[PDB]
Chain A
């Protein structure tokens, strides 16, 4: 099966509104500097 008519720039963009990526949940290292991902390790300091 093939598309029977080309998608318009408008249709194709409407189809894409949900296709983002969410900004990662993140938190400041207490007194270390570089921030890290939530409930994840604080690294080597």
Chain B
């Protein structure tokens, strides 16, 4: 129907990816790519590549007209997180969380 694509365990924290994701959500696919290319945060290129792949198999698979396509929905979910430490003063170690996330984008036409 109205196509989607997903990237899994990207190693950016979900809070961080979500910031870029909010600007893109609900927007026309073209300007979505624009806002993505100009927004200078770290997650922007990653999210870009995901939206590109989404529109790509929205055409090669479901044969929609790419230009009428809209970013119907985008989000990021907590992935598994790598756990590391960080030695400190007095010889105590302390926690560090290298978190990762599943980014999802879904583009669209009309209802049918």
Residues of A within 8 A of B (CB): 20-21, 23-24, 26, 34-37
Contacts and interface: CB of A to CB of B under 8 A. Distances in A.
B95 interface: no
Interface string B31-55: 0001101110100000000000000
Contact of A26 (B19, B34, B41): B34
A21 B38 contact: no
Contacts of B23: 21, 23
Contacts of B34: 26, 34-35
B22 interface: yes
A37 to B, nearest CB: 6
B20 interface: yes
Chain B, interface size: which category? 10 to 19
A21 B39 contact: yes
Most buried by A among B19, B37, B38, B41: B38
B20 A35 contact: no
B19 A24 contact: no
